[PDB]
Amino acid sequence: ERFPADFVWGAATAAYQIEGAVREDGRGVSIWDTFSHTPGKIADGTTGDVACDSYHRYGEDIGLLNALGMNAYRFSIAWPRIVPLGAGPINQAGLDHYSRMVDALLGAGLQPFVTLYHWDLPQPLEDRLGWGSRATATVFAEYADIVVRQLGDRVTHWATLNEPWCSAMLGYYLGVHAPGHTDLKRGLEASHNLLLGHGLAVQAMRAAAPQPLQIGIVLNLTPTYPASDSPEDVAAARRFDGFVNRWFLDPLAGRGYPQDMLDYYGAAAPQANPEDLTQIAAPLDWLGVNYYERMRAVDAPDASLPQAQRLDDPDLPHTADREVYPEGLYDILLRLHNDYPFRPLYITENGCALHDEIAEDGGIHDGQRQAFFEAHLAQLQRALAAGVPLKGYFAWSLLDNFEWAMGLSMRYGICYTNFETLERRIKDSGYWLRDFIAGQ
Length: 440
Ligand SMILES: *[C@H]1O[C@H](CO)[C@@H](O)[C@H](O)[C@H]1F
Fold this sequence. Notes:
It is classed as hydrolase. The protein is an alpha/beta fold. 41% of the residues lie in helices and 15% in strands. Helix 7 runs parallel beside helix 9 (184-208). The longest helix is centred in the middle third of the chain and has 25 residues, at 184-208. The radius of gyration is 21 Å and the shape is globular.
């Protein structure tokens, strides 16, 4: 029934998805500015140029967090505002903005949980191969140092990267996210340099920190289940599990890259000398789990890598874009608790998209999103009962925002955003979360 008294209850955003003000106060160009302004890349012709205008309206966002009774806010810092050239001088005006934001959050009793990298790589670094270059890992660590020196007197909880699998595989292999390349070797090289940048940044942040910090990384994880017990289907499930989950979990845990995936990738695998792997395994103080769906895998030898296709379950509920399987959150947390060394754990992203509209009465009656939260929170109680060291939960997202290649057309907020007027309104699910948290 009851969560621990000191549990962290928050909502989460990312800078490019909400901030707007893309040319203000010295901000440089990110890969997502370039990508969203490329014809045909965004489903609805929108960009993040304005988004929720949270660069100017973060006070309203704080008012929403307060109205919801949250005690934490997970947000990201835009590297293009801090080091507009990617590698080069700092932009003090960008640091001052986030310093004021942090003070406003603390004044409201909200603990900041800061993500350093949520996909907005400075374009000048992509012009020099982006995450395909080891140099980008080095300058990411320099950026991390700069930010912790100025904000680490007030922010204790930091994550280096959000979802490196997406940055590497969607951005460099499948081409659906910025920068939009379509080359497997590039994607795997990017995955290595992202992990190396994480490891270098952890060490840089600890040396620059004015006080002890709690440093983590945030991974999207997908529990995978074979469609049958045949050797082919079980092997497909293992391959998909390696492709998404173990490729990142194992090196972070000091276990190297998984050998079965190295064999499967062959010559496309990155060159990883042991010195890099030692750096990648820098000790972490927590791990963030982003959880949305499961994968029920069937062998697909004709399909592209990793030759495993999803077996849709038409009996399960579906949102605007995903299948709902709350029990997979329990499964993945138990697996992490039993099989990997990371603890404590936070749920850093959990939420769903729906075709939300404002009803005649003025509210947003998003019953499926309420049911989504209720079902996933029940699985967290089961995980806690099993001894999983869970310390907090962040709903994705505080407000409807720019959903990457889907644009403004895919609403994940617990608050509704009118993109024409920038008004925010709490959805029914947000009031349910408020009242549930108040009961705790
Ligand atoms: C986690 O997934 C959500 C929904 O696709 C994205 O909006 C976040 O940026 C990502 F971190």
